[PDB]
């Protein structure tokens, strides 16, 4: 908690009317504390570290921030989100697509249960505004030059401790090698072990730290 402003309403969060409509249609009313504290400076582009439990409304935070950040007329990948598992990545994609039902943004899921060829052809047809998936598959697509880091300004790490527990450290660092240096970084993690803190120290600059 090193940031002052806290906003108790989505209506004051300076969001586009499309995103707001998507939010209220999805089933949300008033933002939980984490959103109230973290959403605005995340849209502003600051590096952000959030430490909250799984079930405090973590997803909707960076979902809203990303969806608001996206330049829709730019038909290229602009946001990259990592998740420890396939199911979680699919869940995040579902949430993002649900909150952006009125916007017109695209969200693709990089999971390892899919056929590489067809997925690549889909990418050839359209470079998704938002990619969300597992570190290994995401890095696979980055390394094979199928996913471009050129327009990626957002890098979200959902449940970092989980990804590191499952041994995605190498992949995360490799993706850091792939992405541009000016890329905004946002990390979410319930626990803060040495490796998480090490990543945040290495790649983030002047972050907004929030504890719930």
């Amino acid at each position: 908690s090193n940031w002052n402003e806290i906003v108790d309403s989505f209506d004051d969060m300076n969001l586009s009317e499309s995103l707001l409509r998507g939010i209220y249609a999805y089933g949300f009313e008033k933002p939980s504390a984490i959103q109230q504290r973290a959403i605005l400076p995340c849209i502003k582009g600051y590096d952000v570290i959030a430490q909250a439990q799984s079930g405090t409304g973590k997803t909707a935070t960076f979902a809203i921030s990303i969806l608001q950040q996206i330049e829709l007329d730019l038909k290229a990948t602009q946001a990259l989100v990592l998740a420890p598992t396939r199911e979680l990545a699919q869940q995040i994609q579902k949430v993002v697509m649900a909150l952006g039902d009125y916007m017109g943004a695209s969200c693709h899921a990089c999971i390892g249960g899919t056929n590489v060829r067809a997925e690549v052809q889909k990418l050839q047809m359209e470079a998704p505004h938002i990619i969300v998936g597992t570190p290994g598959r995401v890095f696979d697509m980055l390394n094979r030059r199928y996913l471009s880091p050129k327009y990626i300004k957002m890098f979200v790490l959902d449940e970092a401790d989980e990804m590191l527990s499952r041994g995605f450290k190498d992949q995360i660092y490799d993706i850091f090698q792939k992405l541009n240096s000016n890329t905004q970084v946002v990390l979410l993690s319930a626990t803060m072990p040495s490796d998480v803190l090490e990543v945040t120290k290495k790649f983030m600059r002047d972050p907004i730290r929030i504890l719930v």
Binding site: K75, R117, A118, Q121, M125, E126
Partner: protein, 246 residues
């Protein structure tokens, strides 16, 4: 029993013909509404998975019947992602429709979408069931710029086909005049890619092409030989060595 255009589609075509040589009138609001209705109709008819070849052919015939300029205008329409009917036709493996678009002889075969890929590059990674489909694919290869490079990483159709180990597709691309010695953004060739991924048969295919240059180096100074050696593919390394130094 020919498929007929709807009244709004036919009249849209008539307005198009009326103002196709009028830039200011084409850019006006109402006319853009018209052109939007027409484009949505055209993509609805030609570019969905469940699209019907006979319907598309009849519609093309009718478009030309109105005006060849109208046909050329409509055929080369692109959506918000830069994708044309040819793109979707290839992507959906509706190669009868691909063939119909090619036979129209007014189709811009080399149009890159906003992702940066051509219909040929899409075809390189497209599912091809029967021999008819592959015939259409090869006709597409021969019609357009087979040696074009994607906007993102400078990938050619051959490089994309090689990267996924598609032997038959590589054969097809080679049969349709794909250049083997072209390099991407990183300076990589199809030979280097095949050597790294370990595709022996594809390496043999590339080396068998007249004028295959195995001396080329990527931006790191690596040749296909050094890449093969570094990746532990010794058989490929022996192939490449025998090729370079005999």
């Amino acid at each position: 029993e020919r498929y007929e255009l709807s009244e709004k589609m036919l009249s849209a075509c008539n307005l198009l013909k009326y103002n196709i040589k009028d830039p200011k009138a084409l850019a006006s609001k109402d006319m853009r509404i018209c052109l939007n209705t027409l484009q949505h109709d055209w993509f609805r008819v030609s570019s969905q998975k469940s699209a019907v070849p006979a319907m598309v052919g009849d519609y093309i015939a009718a478009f030309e019947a109105v005006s060849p300029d109208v046909l050329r205008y409509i055929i080369n329409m692109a959506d918000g992602n830069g994708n044309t009917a040819l793109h979707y036709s290839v992507f959906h493996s509706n190669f009868q429709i691909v063939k119909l678009l090619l036979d129209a002889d007014v189709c811009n075969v080399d149009h890159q979408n906003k992702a940066g890929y051509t219909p040929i590059m899409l075809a390189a990674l497209a599912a091809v069931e029967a021999e008819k489909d592959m015939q259409v694919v090869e006709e597409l290869f021969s019609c357009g710029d087979v040696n074009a490079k994607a906007s993102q990483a400078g990938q050619t159709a051959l490089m994309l086909a090689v990267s996924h180990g598609r032997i038959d597709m590589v054969k097809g691309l080679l049969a349709c005049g794909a250049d083997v010695n072209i390099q991407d953004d990183e300076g990589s060739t199809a030979l280097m890619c095949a050597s790294e991924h370990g595709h022996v048969e594809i390496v043999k295919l590339l080396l068998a092409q007249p004028g295959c240059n195995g001396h080329l180096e990527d931006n790191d100074g690596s040749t296909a030989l050094s890449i093969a050696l570094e990746a532990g593919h010794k058989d490929i390394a022996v192939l490449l060595y025998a090729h370079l130094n005999f």
